[PDB]
Amino acid sequence: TVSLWETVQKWREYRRQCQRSLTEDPPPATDLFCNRTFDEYACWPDGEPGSFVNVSCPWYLPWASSVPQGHVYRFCTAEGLWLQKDNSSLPWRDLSECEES
């Protein structure tokens, strides 16, 4: 029932609101924080070293109303680097709580 065009429009607005935050949000307490970023799926804020960072499931998802308590996660290492998957230069991410159904 949810169309591609409606989802694309919602995603563009999510990206725009995210870009506003990336530019406007105050600087991190220290350089040891992992840097905020938009990874095409979710908008990530700066991360405290050695901690998990969570954001709600992206609101543009067609099934967003079905995962309102969900969160997507990343891990900011003690050295201030987003944990990376051994597979590549991509960050480890846990999106399981935002999957359909």
Binding site: V2, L4, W11, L61, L95
Partner: peptide, 26 residues
């Protein structure tokens, strides 16, 4: 899930889902 409109609706719903899968993996 037995009528032509069930398949058509399913097909239409897949475009949005493929878009998401593309954002996730890419």
């Amino acid at each position: 899930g037995c009528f032509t409109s069930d398949v058509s609706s399913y097909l239409e719903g897949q475009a949005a889902k493929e878009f998401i899968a593309w954002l996730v993996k890419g």
